[PDB]
Structure 1
Amino acid sequence: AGSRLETVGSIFSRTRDLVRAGVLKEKPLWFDVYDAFPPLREPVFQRPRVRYGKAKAPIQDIWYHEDRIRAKFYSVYGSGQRAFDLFNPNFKSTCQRFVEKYTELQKLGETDEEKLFVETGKALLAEGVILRRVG
C-alpha cells in the first residue's frame, strides 16, 4: 500500500516511513540500492514559479576573449566560402585560423588592435588564405 502522495516527500522517504510504520511488510526491490547509492538530490516535488521582480536566472552567457576577434573577422570579411564541417571535432574555420594567428601575434608583444588585425590578414594571405573583405 505504497503512499500515492507524490507531492509529499520523495519515494525514498515515503517508502522508508511506511516500512518503519509497518504498512509495508517487505522493502521494495530498489530500496537497498537507493539507500546504498542515493542521487545527488532527493526527488521531492517542487512547484515551479516565475521570477517576478529583480530576480533573474543565474545563467551566464558563455563568452571568450577570442569572441571579439571572431566578431571583428566576421564583420570585416563575412562568413567566407569554406563551409563549416561541424562533424569533425578538430575542424578549424578560416576565422579560427585568423584567431590563432592573431593570438600568437599578440603573444609576440603587439597591442594595437587594428595593427594586429591587418598584420594577421597579411600573414594569412602569405600562408595562402583568400581573405575576401565584405567591404
Structure 2
Amino acid sequence: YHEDRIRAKFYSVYGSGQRAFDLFNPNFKSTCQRFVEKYTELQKLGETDEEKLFVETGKALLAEGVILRRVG
C-alpha cells in the first residue's frame, strides 16, 4: 500500500513505538498509524514535498502530546 512507504520511514526514524500492539482490538491504532493518518491529511492540503511533509507531521503529533523518541 502507499502508506507502507510512510511506515517504513517511520520505523526507521522513530523505531517501533514503546506502546504495544493490541491485535485483538479490530480498531487499534498505533503511533505509526496515527502518524500515517496525519501524514495523509497534510498531503491532501496540497503539500507535495516528502522530506518536508514528514517533519511537519512529527511536530503536529508532539503538539497533541504524542511521544516520538528518535532512534538516533
TM-score per shorter chain, which class?
over 0.9
- Larger helix proportion of the pair: 2
CA RMSD, 1 decimal: 0.4
CA shift at 1:110, angstroms? Answer: 0.3
Structure 2 residue runs without a partner (length 5+): none
**Residue 80 of structure 1, CA deviation:** 1.5
Q: Which string of whole-angstrom CA distances, capped at 9 and with x for unpartnered residues, describes residues 34-68 of structure 1?
A: xxxxxxxxxxxxxxxxxxxxxxxxxxxxxx00000
CA distance in 2 between partners of 1:126 and 1:132 (Å): 14
Structure index of larger Rg: 1
Alpha-carbon distance between aligned partners in 2 of 1:94 and 1:80, rounded to the nearest angstrom? 6
Partner residue in 2 for 1:87: 24
TM-score, with normalisation over the residues of structure 2?
Answer: 0.98
The higher relative CO (CA closer than 8 Å, separation ≥ 6) is in: 2
Q: What corresponds to 2:45 in structure 1?
A: 108
Can you list the C-alpha shifts for 1:112-133, whole angstroms capped at 9, x where unaligned?
1011110000000001101111
- Residue 69 of structure 2 is aligned to residue 132 of structure 1: yes
Long gaps (5+) in structure 1: 1-63
- Per the alignment, residue 10 of structure 2 pairs with 73
